[PDB]
Structures are given as C-alpha cells and as structure tokens.
C-alpha cells in the first residue's frame, strides 16, 4: 500500500493500556498465583503469552473471570513478566532470573526465555 | 530502574491485537457508523482516541455493547482510522483526506489531525 506510519503509535497504545491496568479499568480477569492476585486484560495477556493465547481461545476458558496458575509459579516472577507485557521493560536481576525464566517458559514468552538463557550463560 | 527493554515488544503486541480483531476474538463492542458496523476492543479504542477514552470511562456507557457515532461521520474515514489504531499505518489519500481529518477531529486523535493538516497545507 501507500500508507504513512506513526513511529510512536504502538508504544503510545501500550502506555495507555498500562494506564488502564493501573487504574483497574476494563480489566476482565484475575490471575491467581498462589496467595497473590493480579488483575489484567485478557487481550493483552493473549498478545504476550502463548499460554494465555491458548487459554482464552478455548471455548470454555475464554469466559472465566479467574485463572489459577500452576502452584510452582513464583508470584514475583509473574509480577515482573506482567509488568513486561504492559511496558516492554523487564526487571531482570541475579536474584530473580531463575524464577523469571521458569515463569517465561511456562507462559510461553520466547523472547524473555531467550534473554534469560543468554544472561545465565554469561555468568557461567 | 535497571530494566532491559525489548524494542519490538509494543509493535508485536499491536500486531497480535489486530490478529484478534481480524478473527473477532474477545471484541466487546460494535461501533455503528450509519449503515456500517465495526467490531473492536474497547481497550484499544480508548488507548487510541480521546472520544472513546471519555465514552468507556463513563459509568453507564462503559457497559454498552453498541455505540452509535454522529450521523455526519463517514464510514470509510472511520474504517481507515480503526485500521490505523490497530496497525500504526494510515491510508491517507487525496480522495479521503477530508473525511479522515474530520473523523480524527471527532475521535480526538491529535497526531492524525496534525498529519492531515500538514498534507492539506502542502497541496494549497
């Protein structure tokens, strides 16, 4: 086509989606990670995670308002990944990298799994 | 913070949101523009438009499944702007620029209004 493109559009959309999440606006699901609960938008979770994409395209699970993750999932690792979904920024630290990588593998977030593998390899 | 950032994350999210729109997955509103109907995600519309942001934060309108736009709104201009919301690409042509600018002013999409004003000024 002969379209023009606004460079900052995708980033501006994601920024506003994070503002709606922070104010709990039109969030339609709560993700339960052991004792912790995280409110989010199903569409953003599906857009970021192969696991959520599979869950919310399922004809019965698409209608659930609560999703319980596997008890081995670390709430902090999930929190870091949810923040990444809504911002493009990943808070990867020596103290959380193992939990972040395991959570990213479970959530099927291949680019996160990749940078965790590389950061771990450099420390070996 | 000491976060790392994935450059293509926002663009990848928007691409997946457009894929969900194309397959009519988790769309929660229909925008009526005279004889034409457009299915979308309320969160994406709010993230792109000052008008939709105001509509869907309203305590009664947030729950509506159908929104009727002003009868002066051109369906093609709306279609072009909805495509822009979900892709960052604007199909701006001599034959549609007036309708696109008027629709962008109504929808409160200031960056689109700006490029339309500039493209019109160059042709004068």
């Amino acid at each position: 086509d002969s379209c023009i493109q606004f460079t900052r559009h995708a980033s501006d959309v994601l920024l506003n989606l994070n503002r709606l999440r922070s104010r709990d606006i039109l969030t339609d699901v709560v993700i339960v990670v052991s004792r912790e609960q995280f409110r989010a938008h199903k569409t953003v979770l599906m857009a970021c995670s192969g696991l959520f994409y599979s869950i919310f395209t399922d004809q019965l699970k698409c209608n659930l308002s609560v999703i319980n993750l596997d008890p081995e999932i670390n709430p902090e690792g999930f929190c870091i990944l949810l923040d990444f979904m809504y911002t493009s920024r990943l808070n990867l630290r020596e103290g959380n990298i193992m939990a972040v990588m395991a959570t990213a593998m479970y959530l099927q977030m291949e680019h996160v799994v990749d940078t965790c593998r590389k950061f771990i390899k450099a420390s070996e | 913070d000491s976060c790392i950032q994935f450059t293509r994350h926002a663009s990848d999210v928007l691409l997946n949101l457009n894929r969900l729109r194309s397959r009519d997955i988790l769309t929660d509103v229909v925008i009526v523009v005279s004889r034409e109907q457009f299915r979308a995600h309320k969160t994406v519309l709010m993230a792109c438009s000052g008008l939709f942001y105001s509509i869907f934060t309203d305590q009664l309108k947030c729950n509506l499944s159908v929104i009727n736009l002003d009868p002066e709104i051109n369906p093609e201009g709306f279609c072009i702007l909805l495509d822009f919301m979900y892709t960052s690409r604007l199909n701006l042509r001599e034959g549609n620029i007036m309708a696109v600018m008027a629709t962008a002013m109504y929808l409160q999409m200031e960056h689109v209004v700006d490029t339309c004003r500039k493209f019109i000024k160059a042709s004068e």
């Binding site: 023009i4 460079t7 | 690409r89």
Partner: peptide, 4 residues
Amino acid sequence: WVIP
C-alpha cells in the same frame, strides 16, 4: 510520521 514515516514511509514504512
């Protein structure tokens, strides 16, 4: 705005 750019030519993509």
